[PDB]
Design a protein around this ligand. Structure first.
Ligand code: HEM
Ligand code: HEM
Lengths: 111, 49, 379, 49
């Protein structure tokens, strides 16, 4: 149950479309996870500040080496890419709480 | 040997090992401000940096 | 005495933005057009000032003074053509500066981006006003059709059209005003460009990745000054290639006959950097609709930052939006191609379709592209 | 305050600025008319007809 609202996508089945898009996006070739490429607004920036030191420091190096790869216009070897199944959201739990906090704060103002 | 050192010797000896030579830099700690090597290398000569 | 603590209580502290400014390491060549744009301003002003020392705005001796510049002034022929082709290089550089922001999401710098549109509008005004200066049957008639578009404005059209014209039509009164206006506006652009940087250095620069580059900033002086110098030479090579090997390749041949209000040119058209906007106006038979679409297409840039939908900033990891971005660039080239062609039955159909697609892509398809991928990435 | 409704507070804030906003628009109207002696506005006033 993935891909498109239809039960079957254009290029057969539904789950493989997201897998196909992950390789098409190409941020795994740089050694970055999905949440390492997110837009840093006033919400995401706070949710980064709550990251544990072991996870925040890991994110820094993944970004640091990706810019080195982008500077040289290169990519990581085929064995060092971020697998689609092994990519996990290390920032979604923190984003959701800031979503919850901001929604309560915003709605409390209008009362 | 110490009594035979003067300004001319120091100017010649220092310029032979310090001037325009590539230095080796080692850092540790919060070295974000530490200048880039090209900025460090260009500090090895005057009026041309 | 601290070498680092330099002559700080002076103007060098401002110049620290040129030497010690942190910049992303992964800056590609598409960023070089920022420094190229500044060189284009300086080059245009330098050649412009020396052109203004022999150009006379009176109608009876406007065209003849341009001929005197090339024929009589020592080395005056090259200066006229680096000015004529510098504007071509200006708008070549100007359109890639806008395109990079579209692709790399630099419009998230709301203050800088908005000042960028103001900078864009000022140059197109300066370029249009300077084209009328030679007064050569393309200057008179190119300004005639475009300026008369303001008559479509309701209840104030003819009032300001004459106030622009200084009379009932384009004449010597308009010509003198344009030369004075063409002299002042470029110096306004320098002031705005300084403000343009002031709204950017506070928030840093952008990278092709689109992620924050605070972890991998490098000094500007030893890495980008030599990168901009190489980029400058590629601009000088490209500009000088036109000037010395095909000076009239871009300019229309009809501009070499003196302006004659009683005679019309075989085909009327602006310079190549406005042909993309001419097609949009010509798409709609209505007069009021055409002028609005002409202004809206240029002013749609300010509406772009409010249309962002994707959770990623740059288009580097957005393959669906990449297919649309080059469709917009290709369509913008279709508008440029069809702008210089007469309004006949093949270009009437293609002209409307290209124009309706230009607005449809940015307003509908691009925001829908970001939403589709956002769903496709579990967020 | 009532169980976190949807935009009641901003409605109250808007109503506070409505009387001044309506009078502020007079400056934009009269001032523009004053600038260019607009023909069909300077006809109802008794002194300036
Ligand atoms: C961003 C700045 C400028 C732009 C984009 C610009 C653009 C142009 C263009 C497109 C032309 C038409 C030339 C032709 O088609 O033959 C022109 C002509 C001219 N410009 Fe400018 N210009 C700029 C600044 C200046 C300045 C600062 C001056 C004077 C100080 C100046 C003086 C002239 C003169 C005298 C002409 C008529 C001579 C000729 O056409 O060769 N321009 N300009
Ligand atoms: C004479 C005209 C202009 C000049 C001299 C100028 C100058 C510059 C320079 C030097 C930069 C920094 C260079 C770089 O970061 O690559 C910059 C940044 C920028 N400008 Fe302009 N600009 C002009 C017109 C425009 C236009 C037409 C736009 C249209 C959107 C614009 C929008 C931007 C944006 C979005 C940035 C962000 C750069 C970044 O994200 O790193 N500017 N401008």
């Amino acid at each position: 149950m993935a891909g498109r609202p239809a039960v079957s996508a254009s290029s057969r089945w539904l789950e493989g479309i997201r897998k196909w898009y992950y390789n098409a996006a190409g941020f795994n070739k740089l050694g970055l996870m999905r949440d390492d490429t997110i837009h840093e607004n006033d919400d995401v920036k706070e949710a980064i500040r709550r990251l544990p030191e072991n996870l925040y420091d890991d994110r820094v190096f993944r970004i640091k080496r990706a810019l080195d790869l982008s500077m040289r216009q290169q990519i990581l070897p085929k064995e060092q890419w971020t697998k689609y199944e092994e990519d996990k959201s290390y920032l979604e739990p923190y984003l959701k709480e800031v979503i919850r906090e901001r929604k309560e704060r915003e709605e409390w103002a209008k009362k | 040997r110490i009594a035979e050192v003067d300004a001319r010797v120091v100017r010649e000896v220092c310029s032979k090992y310090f001037y325009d030579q590539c230095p080796a830099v080692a850092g540790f700690g919060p070295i974000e401000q530490l200048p880039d090597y090209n900025r460090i290398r260009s500090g090895m000569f005057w009026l041309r940096f | 005495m601290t070498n680092i603590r330099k002559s700080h209580p002076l103007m060098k502290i401002v110049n620290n933005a040129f030497i010690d400014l942190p910049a992303p390491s992964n800056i590609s060549s598409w960023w070089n057009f920022g420094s190229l744009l500044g060189i284009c301003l300086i080059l245009q002003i330098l050649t412009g000032l020396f052109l203004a020392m022999h150009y006379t705005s009176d109608t009876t001796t406007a065209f003849s003074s341009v001929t005197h510049i090339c024929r009589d002034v020592n080395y005056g022929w090259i200066i006229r053509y680096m000015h004529a082709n510098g504007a071509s290089m200006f708008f070549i550089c100007l359109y890639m500066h806008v395109g990079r922001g579209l692709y790399y999401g630099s419009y998230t710098f709301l203050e800088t981006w908005n000042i960028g549109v103001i900078l864009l509008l000022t140059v197109m005004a300066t370029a249009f006003m300077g084209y009328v200066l030679p007064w050569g049957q393309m200057s008179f008639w190119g300004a005639t059709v475009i300026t008369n578009l303001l008559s479509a404005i309701p209840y104030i059209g003819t009032n300001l059209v004459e106030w622009i014209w200084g009379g009932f039509s384009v004449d010597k009164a308009t010509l003198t005003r344009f030369f004075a206006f063409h002299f002042i506006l470029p110096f306004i652009i320098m002031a705005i460009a300084m403000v343009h940087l002031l709204f950017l250095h506070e928030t840093g620069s952008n990278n092709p990745t689109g992620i924050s580059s605070d972890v991998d900033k490098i000094p500007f002086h030893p890495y980008y000054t030599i990168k901009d110098i190489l980029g400058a030479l590629l601009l000088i090579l490209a500009l000088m290639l036109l000037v010395l090997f095909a000076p009239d390749l871009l300019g229309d041949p009809d501009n070499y006959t003196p302006a004659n209000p009683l005679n019309t040119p075989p085909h009327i058209k602006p310079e190549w950097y406005f042909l993309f906007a001419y097609a949009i106006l010509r798409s709609i038979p209505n007069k009021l609709g055409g002028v609005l679409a002409l202004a809206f297409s240029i002013l749609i840039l300010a509406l772009i930052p409010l249309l962002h939908t994707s959770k990623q900033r740059s288009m580097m990891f957005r393959p669906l939006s990449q297919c649309l971005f080059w469709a917009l660039v290709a369509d913008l080239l279709t508008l440029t191609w069809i702008g210089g062609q007469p309004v006949e039955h093949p270009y009437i159909t293609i002209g409307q379709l290209a124009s309706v697609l230009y607005f449809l892509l940015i307003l509908v398809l691009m925001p829908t592209a970001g939403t589709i991928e956002n769903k496709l990435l579990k967020w | 305050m009532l169980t976190r409704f949807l935009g009641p507070r901003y409605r109250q804030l808007a109503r506070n600025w409505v009387p001044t906003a309506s009078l502020w628009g007079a400056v934009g109207a009269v001032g523009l008319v004053w600038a260019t002696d607009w023909r069909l506005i300077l006809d109802w006033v008794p002194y300036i007809n």
